[PDB]
Design a protein around this ligand. Structure first.
Ligand SMILES: [Zn+2]
Lengths: 214, 209, 131, 143, 257, 277
């Protein structure tokens, strides 16, 4: 009744209200039968950490890795992963985050929610790093964004497409020369646009006027 | 659903898409049918941010999903759109053409008018972030050969339904669309003269009469 | 520039305090020269060459000369290297001796004439509109 | 001379700095220690770079990545790294036209804002010539 | 929805002290009253002396403060301390964390107290940069994270304004004056959008008017005005305002240069 | 010592006003405070002011009271702020002088040095402009009248501007009227340019002594000439942008006029129709 509410709050993305449930719901299966519930107290520690990993707070993650509380029994595939992914996030080194999407996935592939929020978080990380690498530049040959962000171009411009198209940074990609242009504001002018509407409405009104021919 | 029974989707957009809040099935049809309708019209006339708003986010369609033999297909199309999956777009497009459209007694009549449109959108959506891009990039993406791709764009371009234009010599595609004040200048000049010559024309007629 | 450059040659041997600090005097000249060549010029802009020949300074320093001319407050403005221009937003008001006034009289005569022609030229056009 | 050296806006020229202040710096116990505090001498170099690159942003409207490297005694990877830094903190406004060309330091101003500038210039002008009028009458009376 | 109203004397004393302290930052206190949840009104300001350290908590001087308080009492200026000004010359308008802690030291006096950042140097004869806001370019510091922005307006008495009028005597200079351009951008825009708006109204009157008699039409439309007259009307202001607008600049460029 | 022209910043105006309506002082009484600025040179630059509590002796005051302790308590509490604003003189907002004025100025000679300046702010404004009037006291000992001005320092330039943005006039006069007002203004400028030219002649010829204060202002006139983000294309883009609105507006007139032709032609058709019978 708790951790499920923590789950729904991982659906509504509030992770403080979430950990509110995950902590206690961990404590229960902690002190309880332990027969098969070593694993059901092994489950919630994860989401407890998903909360923090989403919340950027690695101090409380240090707090979560302490031998007796969990590790003493629970040192296992779970902890190395979510740690490395966590400070991997706060360092914002995408190659690291990727490698931790490689060698830790033995759980991540199995646990759906975890892996989900890591795909989300991974996105909203790569987004950010992009938004930081472009703004000092215009006409920045896109290979450069690649080697700097340390990732293959094809999915870079794969995303920069998505960002341009999502109105994020206002620029345009020239694939002929392998370039990325950025702009300060929307380049389009509003005034001229309303002119372009007026000409239309008119161009109808004229026809309807001349219909009065009689 | 009448509006849908004719070419007019633009009404069926709001009509159907809000018919999801409440629906009376015993009247005509099942709830998943009308789901497929509101989702099809939605896909068809909805803007990208209001697609995400009103359809991709569905207090309802989520409650259905696999419920039928269509909503999983057509939604498997729409997500492949909104999320920019180009390799997959055409396959799901063909699917829905077969699975949902042609069986629908209302939609089948309109089948082609749908798909033609649903081609354009993607081409449109693919270019919008590019002031130039090379064919083989596109063809590669969609997974068709160039010559057929060129052949397809040639349908839309001269109709000014698509703001591209092609350079075959270099296999390149550049996009002329009205954003930079320049373009919104030229286009305005042309439209203006197009209004003048008309106005003068009728002008002399009513002068002399 | 040149006349000063002549003047220093004699006294520079005479007064030892002048023997030291010749560097200063040189800089200070280059500056004042710059300031004036800007102050007279009708539209204020300069290539780097212009300053070079005017100040007889090889053009690398020319941007050090300009930048230092600003950091003392003498000029405001910007430098465009790509085209090697200097825009000079504005130049400091400074007490003016006799001869320097004359040129001001000139430029002001010009900017009187332009108005002569414009005002006197705008009645003709639009003579049909006046009130 | 050190504090006065970072107050004013002018190019630093690192070597001369190191030469001049080397002895008096190194003598101090906490700041510039024998082997323990040598890590300060890398910072000082950083602050110097940030200083020159901070002032060039003032005067120069455009500059060529070459000449800017020359002025900073750096390399291109370095340069673009420092520009990237400073702009991330919003200390300077500089935008690099990247393909081996040009840093652009002007804050692009909305042309209407350029206008609202030029008007006020005009108005304050006219006010001045007006005063020069009232005076210019007054002196003949006075004289 | 929340806002502050900053009286003229406040703003001028503000910018004066700020411009005077350059290139070091100055601080002072703000005297006013809280109208409702949605408003803070600032009628007065006084200036706080420099400190050896930067603007900070102890920079506020109790002795000085009350010493000023009573001496304003004798003048009837009695008001709460509703906020505190400040200046970040050259750095734009944002609160450093050190600005924040002090802002808290003004939270626990009054929960609605606000922070006002003034920026002397880049505030210039055009737009004046000013900011007021309270806790929870600038986004680097968490504009929305630790704190949040507010809005500002200016109370003006009739007589106040009337003094301000006589500053500039424009009676001779008129006709070379160019009014604010951005304002005629909202003009030349909103005008056009409007013309669009009434275009299809004139369209509906020509179609409906076509198939329905004048006697019937009058009954309907007499309430509002003849959308053909909003075309005939509205086209003008754009026309002549834009022709004087063009000509004025064409003259200022060639004549003044 | 001897000074001539008196300069005033707008903040003493607004300040003194807020003193008036702050203290609710009705016209039969007056408001009083002191003035800080620069008295040294042969003009007097006023900048700042602050309010002074005082009392007048019932009706027809024989005595009065000013608090000198309030003064010497406030003054140094200003000096801690901007030290360069020195106590100069006082002011009463009463529209016209009082008997004790000349008496109390003699008091302020204690707290200032040269010639304590007394100016009168007009808080009613009901008359025409220059609500100030500047006075000193010279021997006998009456008040010499002095000229004044409102000299906006840069901060007050910015402030007064930003506050008076909205009050700017509509000027509904027809197009011909405006276009006329302009050419009038141009000729005016032309004339003034004459004036300065032949004056400068008189400087290099008539040997009217060099007046620096003017030359400074000429220079300041040059500093403001637009160089002409280049402003040039900044202007071009505008003029294009207006010419658009001019143009499509013209389209709107044209189509309207065409409509009215439709109304004529239809009208004459039905009238001439009826003239049959
Ligand atoms: Zn601060």
């Amino acid at each position: 009744l708790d951790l499920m509410s923590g789950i729904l709050h991982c659906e509504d993305k509030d992770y403080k209200t979430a950990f509110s449930y995950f902590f206690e719901s961990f404590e229960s299966y902690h002190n309880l039968t332990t027969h098969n519930s070593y694993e059901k107290a092994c489950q919630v520690l994860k989401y407890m950490l998903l909360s923090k990993i989403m919340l950027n707070l690695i101090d409380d993650v240090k707090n979560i890795l302490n031998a007796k509380y969990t590790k003493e029994t629970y040192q296992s595939r779970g902890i190395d992963a979510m740690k490395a992914v966590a400070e991997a996030y706060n360092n914002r080194s995408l190659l690291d985050f990727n490698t931790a999407l490689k060698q830790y996935e033995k759980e991540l592939m199995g646990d759906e929610l975890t892996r989900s929020h890591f795909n989300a978080l991974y996105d909203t990380l790569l987004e950010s790093n992009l938004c930081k690498i472009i703004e000092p530049f215009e006409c920045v040959e896109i290979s450069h964004i690649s080697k700097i962000i340390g990732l293959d171009t094809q999915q870079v411009e794969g995303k920069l497409s998505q960002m341009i198209l999502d109105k994020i940074f206002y620029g345009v990609l020239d694939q002929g020369n392998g370039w990325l242009y950025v702009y300060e504001t929307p380049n389009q002018d509003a005034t001229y646009d309303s002119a372009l509407e007026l000409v239309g409405q008119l161009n109808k009104v004229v026809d309807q006027l001349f219909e009065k021919a009689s | 659903i009448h509006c849908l029974a004719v070419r007019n989707f633009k009404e069926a957009a709001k009509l159907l898409v809000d018919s999801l809040a409440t629906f009376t099935s015993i009247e005509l049809t099942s709830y998943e049918s009308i789901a497929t309708y509101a989702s099809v019209t939605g896909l068809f006339t909805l803007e990208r941010t209001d697609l995400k708003s009103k359809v991709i986010d569905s207090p309802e369609l989520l409650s259905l999903i696999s419920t039928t033999a269509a909503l999983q297909s057509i939604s498997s199309l729409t997500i492949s759109l909104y999320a920019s999956d180009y390799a997959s777009y055409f396959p799901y497009l063909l699917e829905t053409y077969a699975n949902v459209l042609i069986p629908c007694k209302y939609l089948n009549r309109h089948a082609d008018f749908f798909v033609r449109e649903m081609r354009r959108k993607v081409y449109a959506q693919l270019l919008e972030s590019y002031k130039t891009l090379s064919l083989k990039s596109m063809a590669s993406a969609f997974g068709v050969s160039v010559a057929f791709l060129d052949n397809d764009l040639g349908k839309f371009i001269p109709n000014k339904q698509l703001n591209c234009v092609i350079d075959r010599v270099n296999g390149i595609v550049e996009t002329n669309r009205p954003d930079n004040k320049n373009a919104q200048y030229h286009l305005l000049v042309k439209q203006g003269d197009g209004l003048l010559t008309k106005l003068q024309k009728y002008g002399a007629a009513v002068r002399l009469t | 520039f040149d006349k000063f450059d002549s003047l220093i040659k004699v006294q520079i041997s005479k007064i030892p305090i002048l023997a030291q600090h010749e560097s200063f005097l040189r800089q200070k000249i280059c500056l004042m020269t710059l300031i004036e060549t800007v102050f007279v010029k009708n539209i204020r802009m300069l290539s780097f060459e212009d300053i070079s020949k005017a100040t007889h300074l090889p053009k690398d320093n020319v941007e050090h000369l300009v930048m230092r001319a600003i950091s003392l407050g003498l000029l405001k403005g910007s430098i465009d290297q790509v085209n090697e221009l200097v825009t000079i937003s504005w130049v400091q008001p400074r007490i003016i001796s006799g001869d320097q006034i004359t040129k001001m009289k000139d430029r002001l005569v010009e900017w009187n004439d332009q108005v002569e022609k414009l005002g006197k030229k705008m009645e003709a056009r639009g003579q049909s509109i006046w009130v | 001379s050190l504090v006065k050296l970072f107050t004013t806006n002018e190019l630093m020229r690192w070597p001369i700095v190191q030469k001049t202040y080397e002895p008096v710096l190194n003598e101090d116990d906490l700041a510039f220690g024998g082997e323990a505090n040598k890590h300060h001498w890398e910072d000082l170099q950083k602050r110097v770079i940030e200083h020159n690159l901070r002032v060039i942003s003032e005067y120069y409207s455009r500059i060529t990545l070459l000449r800017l490297n020359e002025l900073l005694d750096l390399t291109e990877s370095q340069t673009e790294t420092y520009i990237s830094d400073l702009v991330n903190q919003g200390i300077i406004y500089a935008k690099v036209n990247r393909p081996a060309k040009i840093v652009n330091f002007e804050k692009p101003k909305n042309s209407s804002q350029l206008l609202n500038e030029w008007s006020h210039n005009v108005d304050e002008l006219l006010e001045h010539i007006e005063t020069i009028g009232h005076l210019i009458t007054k002196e003949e009376i006075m004289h | 929805k929340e806002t502050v109203y900053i009286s003229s004397i406040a703003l001028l004393k503000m910018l004066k002290h700020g411009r005077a302290g350059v290139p070091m930052e100055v601080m002072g206190l703000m005297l006013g009253e809280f109208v409702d949840d949605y408003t803070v009104n600032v009628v007065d300001v006084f200036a706080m002396p420099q400190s050896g350290t930067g603007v900070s908590v102890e920079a506020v001087d109790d002795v000085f403060q009350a010493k000023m308080m009573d001496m304003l009492k004798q003048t009837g200026r009695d008001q709460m301390v509703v906020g505190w000004y400040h200046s970040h010359p050259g750095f734009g308008c944002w609160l450093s964390s050190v600005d924040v802690n002090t802002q808290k030291s003004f939270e626990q006096l009054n929960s609605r107290a606000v922070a006002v950042v003034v920026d002397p140097i880049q505030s210039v004869k055009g737009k004046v940069v000013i900011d007021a806001f309270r806790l929870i370019q600038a986004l680097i510091h968490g504009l929305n994270r630790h704190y949040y922005s507010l809005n500002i307006d200016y109370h003006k008495t009739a007589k106040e304004t009337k003094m301000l009028m006589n500053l500039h005597k424009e009676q001779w200079q008129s006709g070379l004056k160019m009014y604010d351009y951005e304002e005629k951008e909202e003009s030349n825009l909103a005008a056009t959008k409007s013309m669009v708006k009434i275009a299809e109204q004139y369209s509906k009157r020509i179609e409906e008017e076509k198939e329905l008699t004048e006697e019937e039409l009058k009954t309907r439309y007499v309430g509002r005005q003849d959308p053909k007259k909003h075309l005939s009307e509205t086209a003008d202001e754009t026309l002549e305002n834009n022709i004087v607008s063009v000509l004025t600049a064409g003259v200022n460029s060639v004549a003044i240069k | 010592l001897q000074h001539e022209k008196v300069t005033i910043a707008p903040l003493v105006l607004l300040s003194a006003l807020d003193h008036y309506e702050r203290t609710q002082t009705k016209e039969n009484k007056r408001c009083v405070g002191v003035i800080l600025g620069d008295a040294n040179s042969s003009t007097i630059r006023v900048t700042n002011s602050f309010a002074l509590p005082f009392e007048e002796d019932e009706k027809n005051s024989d005595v009065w009271f000013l608090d000198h302790n309030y003064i010497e308590n406030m003054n140094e509490m200003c000096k801690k702020i901007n030290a360069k604003e020195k106590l100069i003189g006082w002011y009463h907002s009463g529209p016209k002088l009082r008997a004790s004025d000349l008496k109390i100025n003699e008091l302020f000679k204690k707290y200032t040095q040269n010639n304590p300046l007394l100016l009168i702010v007009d808080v009613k404004q009901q008359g025409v402009g220059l609500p100030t009037d500047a006075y000193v006291a010279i021997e006998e000992k009456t008040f010499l009248h002095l000229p004044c001005t409102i000299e906006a320092e840069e901060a007050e330039e910015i402030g007064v501007e930003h506050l008076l943005r909205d009050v700017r006039d509509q000027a509904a006069g027809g197009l011909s009227i405006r276009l006329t007002n302009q050419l009038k203004s141009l000729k005016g400028l032309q004339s003034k340019l004459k004036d300065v030219v032949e004056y400068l002649d008189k400087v290099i010829n008539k040997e009217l002594p060099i007046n620096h204060t003017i030359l400074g202002k000429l220079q300041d006139v040059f500093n403001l000439l637009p160089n002409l983000n280049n402003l040039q294309k900044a202007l071009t883009v505008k003029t294009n942008d207006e010419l658009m609105v001019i143009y499509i507006s013209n389209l709107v007139r044209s189509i309207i006029a065409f409509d009215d032709l439709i109304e004529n032609k239809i009208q004459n058709k039905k009238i001439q129709e009826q003239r049959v019978k």
